[model samples]
Target chain A: TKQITLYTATFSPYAHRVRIALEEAGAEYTTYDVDILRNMPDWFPLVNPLKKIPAMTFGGPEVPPDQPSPESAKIAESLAMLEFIADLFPDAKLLPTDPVLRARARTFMALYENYVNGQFRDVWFLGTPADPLLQALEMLQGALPPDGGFAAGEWSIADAAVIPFLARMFPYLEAGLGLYSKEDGVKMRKAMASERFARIRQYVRDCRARPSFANTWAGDAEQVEAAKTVPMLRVGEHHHH
Target chain B: TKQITLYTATFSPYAHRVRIALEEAGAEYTTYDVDILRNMPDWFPLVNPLKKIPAMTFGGPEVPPDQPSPESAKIAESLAMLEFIADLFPDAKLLPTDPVLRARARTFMALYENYVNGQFRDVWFLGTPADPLLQALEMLQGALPPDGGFAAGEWSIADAAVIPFLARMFPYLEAGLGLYSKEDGVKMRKAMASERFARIRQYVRDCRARPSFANTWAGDAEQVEAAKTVPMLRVGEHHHH
Candidate 1:
């Protein structure tokens, strides 16, 4: 076995995604937080030239995260890292063995990334309309099994990929923590809690109950505070295009 | 062996991605062209509720493509299908076996999907500025191994995910396709042909040399003709916001 170092931040759902997968895989890893948004360190590019959170350095000589070794393979992108963890720890079964089940897991992640992630970003950072986001979430909700379960029946990396955003929604909304207009915020808050979203509510609860989620997440109040530190969230100020 | 049927369209790069992978997998599969952009069949939703091309039905009773069986598992999303093909035909080695190499493949695909695909869409569909697309392309080109080979050294699903779009860029530009302004088109053409893009040019050539691409792709002139059928391309017409 070799050393694994993850450059991550508490506020980043992307980084949080990889953390959950690592925990699920029961991998021994080190996480070094990086304030990528406000004060990204110069050495950060050595790990990820894109200077994004959730970068991983795998199989390097044991060194401090700040001194990332050239011998290690630097991996970027959260979804890639999720799959990498699955490959590295096959015994953990990060993904299902069945081909169709695996496809469902991959499709669920893709659907969230392609459709829902942008809506979240636009609504939170640019104060775009919430209706589109709600619709996308509903579509995602429909993808889940009618009976209670993870995105692919049994828990998989797909659940890890989505739960961070869904988990954030409740606390962040309760804290009044985004750039959306007050009207849209109220609309979203009501929409999320309404009977119309009963299944997704259960989905959120099921995911949060997992030890993997419990280990990685800062508590609700603390996470909201960490999210507030993000300059883009702009807790009180109105966002302008 | 389970039956595999792919709903595809020649003009769609998304659909093309899966086709290339299937061909590379040496799969015994049937392809049915769907005119999704202009004339999506009502029954298309039965196969892919999202009404997207490259929807796949696996392990169902053999039936006509027009009448999709409920018994079969309907898999949507191109990347998911690519992975499914890889899973189904592990002997084909669609992805590298090493965890680190697999991460490289997955990262390459994610990089293209997250950063580069949107730029291509904006420029082609919305007549947006070309500079951003070119810059994004350069960044993607930089990700390639400096010496040679596919996105992750040997051919992987990552190449399948990207080659369709990159392959289209040259032919589409040569045929004066897309909604970009004439001035911006010239800028893109020159920039792509220049030394700055030499590596990507070679990358495209290397991918094209593969039989997977040869079997899946219509001839350049024929593909450009097929793209002409797409209402969004609107050949010879200027795009408006």
Candidate 2:
């Protein structure tokens, strides 16, 4: 029994990030679903005024009993929240103790955030000129050599949060989410999905299969509908899962 | 004597971010300036195809000499860059050792990024509204208690990076840069500039004094000059600075 209560939303890649961190870190906690829609719930704002997901109230044994609240030291960003969880679970050793190797993992996750994830927003979500994601994929594939381990290896925190988003976005890449010919985008999708890319791909598969994954991604119908309406700008999958 | 190379630019806030981290951490590192005004150097794409600023290449007695070449492990992104530097120098501890505290620091930084830094291109550069920045200010001001403490007290990496930006935007906020009124915006800025906010102000002042801040920002003069030449928007858009 843990004193932590996680505020989450299904289909939010960010919320999935927290869920994965809790599972891999082997912590017991309660998770509350956040409803962020036209009729946005009043309680959700107290937890996250941005009306976003993956906020946590770290009460219970770790905090004073009176401190329990939806807004207990509110944290919203997924990666940052996950890192917080990693730091809490020392026995889990979610982060590599070696400073340099840890930097490498942090570097990979940040690069992906700015390059792949950031571009996903511009080209695939909000709709911008130039298909920056193509350039991002080219760099990502080139960034990884066939002989590497998981993102800094040892099945660490970085891999748990990032790979699943890549898996979900596979639909967009495979279906050629408009803005470019399928001929142009399908090859990149195949390369990511290829058997030769076993380590990275399996990391994604395993992440999605995790029990917590279903819990986090279950109810993103609105996002999916948004993706269907605007395929190239699909902000759909939970990358942090 | 550590062997370190920082991928930097005179005109990028992101680049300036790394500079502050290095200085505060008291690490000995060489700055490698990149001309972001021009197309990224061909060699840079090998390092980072997105060709963004504040990237760093780490090497030292601790790092295997051959691990990160120009083509791989090129650390980029501002927050990530800071974390990397922080990890190398445990003594620095720009972020708190307590996992929850560190997350609070991160949350504040992202809040700064989301409500603060994220609004920059839109308010100052684009015709995008100032409401976002104004809303950002309210959000940021709310992050602090009635009393200030440099985003986490005792000068963490978040303070090093965030306060500097807040300082730069000071002048623009007087007349209001986007949606904020000059008087209202000063409520926060003046608090930061005051003796009570002495630690925060000193960190910010130090950053502005850097050669890089001047160099990165000088281009803005030309940008502002260019703005004058264009027929101003006769459509009186009451945007707060």
Candidate 3:
């Protein structure tokens, strides 16, 4: 059995991506949450010099998550971890078998990473305009199978890669958690609920219904609570009349 | 034999990435250049709705590149194309066999895509400060094996993903091709030539030595000429005293 330990944080969608992949791979792994935003542990950099969460240590003598073993290979980047889990657990089919289907899975993940993710970060962290974000979300929604199913016509690491951020949006929007204005939040909430975004709503529902997502995800309300801890979210700073 | 067609652009590092990957995979494929920046062909949308270079079609009835068949799986995003090639040509070992080594390849690509590529884009296209680009390049250099090897210790798709942009940097800097100021360009040239960037210089040289790179790359001077056609580069606009 491979010895896998993941250093994670509750509020990070990136770490959540890898967690879903691990669950999908049905791998036995240990998780240790780190307070990356408020109080980063000095040793956290030992696992990932960039000091980011979603770092994984594989194949070393068993040790406490805090005490990372040098003998283990330390891997960072959430997408990389997802691919690693797929490679390590090939039978699990974290990605589809056909080359075209696999391309769809990878293309879906790339589309999220390249287009949608930065918009989410900007809106939540920087109070950027929501129109571009909504537009990007629509483009991503159009990439789905249309009739039904995950990004690649089946549950895949592509779904794992995206659902964390997508799942966070509804709860975050409903709770008015992001840096966007109250008016913009209302705009987003309505846009997400209306017919225009019906496909993405279904996509999120299909992804959430999976056991992999269910096992890995905190409930929507609880997730919003966890996201409250993120300093960038400015949970209490946005005051409404 | 699978039918493969790539919509490419001579000046696009993005398209170059996929071309290199195809060469490395030793797959017989067709390439058709599209002037994406200046004169995007209307029919280009049929191959890639995003109208991006590096669009690929697989397993379709062989037709003229301009007349893309709907039956072919249209794959976009250069990274996704790299992964597709890797998946289709598993015997080519575009990625490593071991999961840990594979993680290194994926992580390195992520580091480039996430941290370094943006800085390059900003510096070259937006003419942003060069210091941040240098810092990001240094960080990427540190990820490479100190003993001198490709990213992940073998010539993997990770190398294919990065070499295009890195190769462009030297020629573009020498020709003063980007939108960056002459002073910043000089700073970049000096910094890249110095011991501080020796690893990356060696890395570029190593990647350039490969036949995949050699075949796919129009020679440095010719590539600069192609990039001159890029309106964003503002090729001859920056007049030196």
Q: Pick the candidate with the highest lDDT.
A: 1
The alpha-carbon deviation from the true structure for residue B171 of candidate 1, after best TM-score superposition, in angstroms, is 1.1
Candidate 3 local distance difference test against the native: 0.90
- Enumerate the chain B TM-scores of all models: 0.98, 0.68, 0.97
Model 1 per-residue lDDT tens digits across residues B45-110:
999988889889998899999998999999999999999999999999999999999999999999
Tens digits of per-residue lDDT for model 1 on A1-241?
A: 8888999999999999999999999999999999899999889999999989989999878999998899999999999999999999999999999999999999999999999999999998899999999999999999999999999999999999999999999998898888888888899999999998999999999999999999999999999989989987765676543
Q: Which wins on DockQ, candidate 1 or candidate 3?
A: 1
lDDT, each prediction: 0.93, 0.61, 0.90
Question: Which window of 10 residues has the lowest lDDT sum in candidate 2 chain B?
Answer: B227-236
Clashing pairs in 2: A13-A238, A124-A233, B10-B216, B11-B216, B176-B241, B177-B240, B177-B241, B178-B240, B178-B241, B179-B240
lDDT of 3 by residue, A100-136 (tens): 8999999999999999999998888888889999999
lDDT minimum window of 10 residues, candidate 2 chain A: A232-241
The per-residue C-alpha lDDT of model 2 at residue A166 equals 71
